[PDB]
């Protein structure tokens with residue numbers, strides 16, 4: 001995998017959208033001491049080239065960091081090609097509002113939280 | 125995943141690092157997070173890991189400015205995973221780096237040693 005550079009856009013290309021769609025995404029947040037945290041998120045989807053969404057089922061450290069104001073970094077990597085894309089995003093969390101209810105009605109996790117991610121920057 | 129109150133990997137956690145793709149995360153000096161895969165990650169002992177920095181990209185720049193380093197080794201199908209928080213020591217072309225890289229095709233990479241501060245699972 002190559003070093004990534006800032007692409008000076010907040011819009012994914014189609015190839016990058018397909019990276020996010022087709023691979024297990026990893027997400028990183030920042031804890032209360034300013035340290036990183038990282039873990040996999042299987043429920044990631046792409047709403048449009050500047051917005052992603054996932055379900056927060058565990059409500060663990062990532063969620064607590066986000067609730068405390070952390071920004072979110074995401075990566076989607078394709079090992080066979082060694083291609084990857086990363087984003088920096090701000091999180092918009094929907095716990096039990098009508099938007100959450102609408103989104104979750106299409107899933108089997110009615111008590112999850114719906115986290116939308118507004119892409120600020122793309123790196124590749 | 126919860127703090128285990130140790131800086132030492134268990135045998136199961138060593139195997140998780142050995143058998144799965146590891147992801148690394150850092151923060152820039154303003155606190156914005158970064159995350160990416162690290163295929164060269166290796167456990168040296170229960171409290172130390174090591175990887176190669178071949179590209180010297182954003183994780184590198186963040187570490188240079190003092191970022192601590194988070195790692196995860198997840199076997200997602202098996203529902204097992206381990207996370208660490210560590211500090212880095214960067215070896216660019218000292219005798220240690222040379223010794224390590226002699227066993228690789230990457231003689232100009234930097235060697236980054238990670239000292240585990242906390243394990244989570």
Ligand SMILES: [Cl-]
Pocket residue numbers: 012013014015
């Ligand atoms: Cl495109």
